[PDB]
Amino acid sequence: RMKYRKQQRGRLKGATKGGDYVAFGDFGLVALEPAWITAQQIEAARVAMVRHFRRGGKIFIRIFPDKPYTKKPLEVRMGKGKGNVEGYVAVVKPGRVMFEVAGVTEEQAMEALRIAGHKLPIKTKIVRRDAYDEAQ
Amino acid sequence: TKNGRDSQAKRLGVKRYEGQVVRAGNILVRQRGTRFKPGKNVGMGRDFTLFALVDGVVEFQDRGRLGRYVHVRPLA
Amino acid sequence: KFRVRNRIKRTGRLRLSVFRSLKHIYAQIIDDEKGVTLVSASSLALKLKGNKTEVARQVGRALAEKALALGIKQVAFDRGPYKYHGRVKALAEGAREG
Amino acid sequence: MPRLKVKLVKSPIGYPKDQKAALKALGLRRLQQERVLEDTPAIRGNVEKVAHLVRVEVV
Amino acid sequence: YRLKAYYREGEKPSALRRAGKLPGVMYNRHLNRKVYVDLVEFDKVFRQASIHHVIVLELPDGQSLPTLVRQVNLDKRRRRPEHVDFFVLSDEPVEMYVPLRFVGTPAGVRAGGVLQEIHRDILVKVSPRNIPEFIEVDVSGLEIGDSLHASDLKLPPGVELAVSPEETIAAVVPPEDVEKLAEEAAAE
RNA sequence: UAGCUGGUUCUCCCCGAAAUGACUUUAGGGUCAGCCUCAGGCGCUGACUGGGGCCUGUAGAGCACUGAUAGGGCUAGGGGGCCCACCAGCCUACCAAACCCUGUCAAACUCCGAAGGGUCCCAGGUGGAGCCUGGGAGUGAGGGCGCGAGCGAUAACGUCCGCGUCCGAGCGCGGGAACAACCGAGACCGCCAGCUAAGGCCCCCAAGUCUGGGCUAAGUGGUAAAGGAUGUGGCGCCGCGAAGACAGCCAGGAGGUUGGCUUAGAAGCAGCCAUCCUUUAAAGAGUGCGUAAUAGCUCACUGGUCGAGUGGCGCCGCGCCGAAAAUGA
RNA sequence: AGAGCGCAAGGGUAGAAGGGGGCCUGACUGCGAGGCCUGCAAGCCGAGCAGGGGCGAAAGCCGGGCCUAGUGAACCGGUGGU
RNA sequence: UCCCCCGUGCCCAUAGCGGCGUGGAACCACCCGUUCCCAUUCCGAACACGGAAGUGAAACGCGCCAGCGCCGAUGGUACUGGGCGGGCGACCGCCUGGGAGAGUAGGUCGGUGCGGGGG
Ligand SMILES: [Mg+2]
Ligand SMILES: [Mg+2]
Ligand SMILES: [Mg+2]
Ligand SMILES: [Mg+2]
Ligand SMILES: [Mg+2]
Ligand SMILES: [Mg+2]
Ligand SMILES: [Mg+2]
Ligand SMILES: [Mg+2]
Ligand SMILES: [Mg+2]
Ligand SMILES: [Mg+2]
C-alpha cells in the first residue's frame, strides 16, 4: 500500500455499500455480518482456495484491506497506539462479495468456497450467478 | 508523541442573513477568502470582510460563474 | 479583456460605452443595474462625414447636447478595451470640453 | 378553527425540554387534565410534537 | 415471454412487497405509469428472460406492450430485486445489451488454461424488429495471453456496436497453484 | 499560619441551583462569566410553535480533484530468449509508468448532497416567561442511561468531548425478587372511597387454572459462539411415478483394455493425459474397499420381483449438540 | 486552472490577488459612524470627515505585502523633543 | 408592427469541443501604407495614426446534426427530526413526517433586455 500512518476506528453502520453483485467468475462468496477482515484472513482463504483444487482456474478477491489496525504493546495511555500489529483490514458489510472463482467446475467451487468460509470470521453464504446485472 | 496542537477558533462564516435589518457598517459576513463577493452597497477589507455601507436589508444572489454576491437594498 | 469595464460598473451610474470601429466610432450612455442606453450618438452610422479623429470630436459634442438636455452630467466614461490616446481620446475629449 | 379537546395521559417526566415547553404553551399542568383550544396552525404543530403524550379530540 | 402486470396508484411501496408483489414502472419517450408485477411470476419469467429478450406486459386494459427491463434495483443485504423498470418499444432503433455465446475450444484450455470472459453481453444500437437470441463468438484461435476485442466482433445485419471500437471481450489467464504459492510466499 | 479535616444549637412558609467556560507556581483554592433568589422598574418581548427568506458540507452516495486499489486490454521502460555486433528487428501463459474499460476504498478526498439545525421578519403564546438596574449566595471532583465521535482491543461499573434525560437534591410511592439514576409516576395534610400507569391476573400474592388459533417436549422457557445434525411444523420450486416410481430383493455387472504415458509394482482402484467401438433389455475408456500387483466384494445401468407414492432444493418459526469451577442447591 | 500568489496548511484567485514597464513613497498625521469576537483585558474590520500628498485624462485607488501565524499587560529605566 | 445586423446588460453550459453550410452593397474584421500622434525589453505581429483596391479565407454573426461536454425526470431505495420494539454484542425491524446520490427514459448546438443602422 501507500498513503500515511494511522486512521480512525469508525463504526460499521448498515450493510449498504458493503455489498455488490457477482461481477466476475461464475460463483461467489457473500458476507452475512459486518466485520473488519484481516490481511491474514484473506491469505488464509486464498491459499486454501487454490490449494484445494490444484492447478485451478482464476480466483477473484474483490475486497481489499487498507485500514491500519491499531494496537498498544500491553501498557497504558501515552499518545495514540502504534497499531500495525495485525496489519490492515477491509470494511466488510453484509451483502459484500469477498471471493469468486471461475473457469472451474461447480463441485470444486462449491467445496473451495465452503472451505474458505471457515477461514473467515463472518458466517457466510454462497451465491451462484443468475443474470442480475443491469441492461435491457 | 508530538501532536497536541491547534490555533483557537476564528469563528468565521455568515454573520448576517437575508431579511435582516442593518445599520451602517455592520460586518455582514466574515470569510476566509472570496466565498462571497461584495455587491450593491457592500464593501470589504483586507481579511475579505463583508460589511454594509448603507442601511437596509441583506440579500444574497448566486450567479454561477461570477459567484455568490451579497448586497443591501436601501430604504427608509 | 475588460477589466476596466468592471471597475467602472461598481463605480456608479451612467456608463459611456465607447465602442469604435476601424473607421466608425459609436458611443452610448448605458446605465447599469437595469441596462438602458440614453444618449446614443453614433458616428459613421449616423450622419457625420469621414475623418475618424475630427468626427470623434463632433460626435462627442453630439452627446453633450443630447445629454445636457436630459439633465445628465456624470462622466462615467467607458474605455471599452481601448487605449486612451487617439480616437477614443477625442470622444470624452470633446464631450467633456462642453 | 374548531375546538380541540386535549387530555394529558403520558407524564412528561423523562422527555426533552422543548416538549415540556410545548405543554406549557398549550397550558397543560397535571395528569388527566382537560384543555379545549382552537385548531390554529401553530397550536396544531405543538400538540403534534407531543401527540404521544396526549389524546386529541375533534370538538 | 408474457407477464401479468397491473396498474399502481397509492398502494404502499413497502407494504406492497410483503404481500407478494414486486413494485415497478413502465415508460418510454412518451409513456409513464406506476405498475407492479408478481414476485414468483416475475422471478421464473425473468430467470430465463433476464435483460436480452423482449417481454410483453398484459395490462388489464388488454394492452400488449413490448417492454424490456431498462434497469433493476437490486436490494443490498442478501440479493433480491427491489424495483424494476420497463422500457416500451415501438419501431425506432434502440440500444441494448445483447447476449454472447462464446463457442469453441480455445488453444488456452489445451495447454491448461482459464476461460476468461469479459463482456458476457454487449450494448448495440438495433431496430426493435431485430431480436437476436445471441451472437456467435468465434473464440478458438485464442491462445494463452491472448484476447479478443470489439473491433473483431461478428455483427449480424442491421446492427452496429454501440460501444468503443477497441473494448475487450474475453481472454485466457493461467492457473495459480503451487508454483505461485511457493514462489510468492518467499518473494514477498 | 493551616487554600487542609472535624463540629456549627428552635419552628413553619415561597422559590431553588452547580459539579461548565476563560486566566491562574492554577488543578481538592480562587477572579470574571453561566446557572439560583430577592427588591425596584419595562410589559407580549419568553420558552415552545405555524409560515416565509437566507446560511452550512454530516449521514448517505459518488469517483469530477488528492491517493489507494483487484482483473483485462493497450503501451514507454527494465529483465530473458532467436539472433549478429553494421544495431536493429521479433517473440516474451515475465516486473511494469502513463491512458481506457471492468470493480472498489477514504476523519484530514468531494462532481453531488438530505433529514436537521442556526438566524431575521410576520402570527398564536399571561408563564415561577422574558428584558433592564442593584443586594445576596452557593457552584467551579459529578455520575449512570440513550444517541453521535475520539482513545481502548468495535475490553472495562474505562476514559475523554457533543445532544438529551434521570439520580444529584425525588435512598418518597408502584413495577423490576432484592438494586441512586431501566419502565410508571412529580408526595400541602386527612378518609376502612372510585378509575387507572407500568407490570401483571394458579399458590406464597391483589386480579381470568378466561376465550379462540397454532408452535415446543428441551425444563427449551430459566436467556453464550463459529460450526455441526432424516428433531418437529408451515410455505414455494424442479426431477422420477399406475405406459409401473424410491428402498430392499434375484441375476448379470463382459470383450479389446493389463484405457494411452508411466511404472520395482498399477491391471477401472500410487502418479499425468487422452477422453472409442461391439453385444444388449443392460455393463461406464469406470465410484468405493482390497491386494506388492491380479484375482474378489460394490454402485450407476437393465430386466423380473413389488405396488403407492418418492427424492432433491430453497425459505419462515420453536427446539438439540457445541456447554468444565471451586461452602448448598 | 490541475501553475503562480516570498515561507506551513487551508479558503480564495487569471472577469488577478499572478508576470512586466512608467511615475513614485498613503510602510501618512489628526479622527472614526457602526460592527464581528468576547468573562476581563486583548484582538479584528471599517465607511465617511479634515488637513496634505502620490499615480491617472478621468471616474478613482493608497491609512503597507491575496488572507488567516511571525508575538509580550503592568512595573522599573534609557535617548530626542513638547 | 415584423426580419437581418452593431453595441451593450441579464439567465450562468439545454447558450460550449466539434463537423458542415451560409453572409459581404450596407455593418464588422482582415487588408495598404508608416510622414505625423504613439509603440513593440526585437518586429506596425498588438497598441496607435491617414485611408483607396481586394476578400469574407481567418474571426465574428445565423442556421443544421447529438459523436464528446453539459442539463436529466419518474418509480423505488440509502439516510433521518419525532414516536416504539428485538439481540448477548457487532446490530436489526415497525408507525408518522421528510427524502437524495447513482442509474434509466429523456432534453440541448441557446433564450432575453434597451439603445442604434438598413428594408
Ligand atoms: Mg464463518
Ligand atoms: Mg479548579
Ligand atoms: Mg461568581
Ligand atoms: Mg461517509
Ligand atoms: Mg425558520
Ligand atoms: Mg450526564
Ligand atoms: Mg432533577
Ligand atoms: Mg425503585
Ligand atoms: Mg396493560
Ligand atoms: Mg447442552
Ligand SMILES: [Mg+2]
Ligand atoms: Mg492553487
Ligand SMILES: [Mg+2]
Ligand atoms: Mg499586478
Ligand SMILES: [Mg+2]
Ligand atoms: Mg503584488
Ligand SMILES: [Mg+2]
Ligand atoms: Mg472587549
Ligand SMILES: [Mg+2]
Ligand atoms: Mg493574534
Ligand SMILES: [Mg+2]
Ligand atoms: Mg479632503
Ligand SMILES: [Mg+2]
Ligand atoms: Mg510590580
Ligand SMILES: [Mg+2]
Ligand atoms: Mg460564399
Ligand SMILES: [Mg+2]
Ligand atoms: Mg439524481
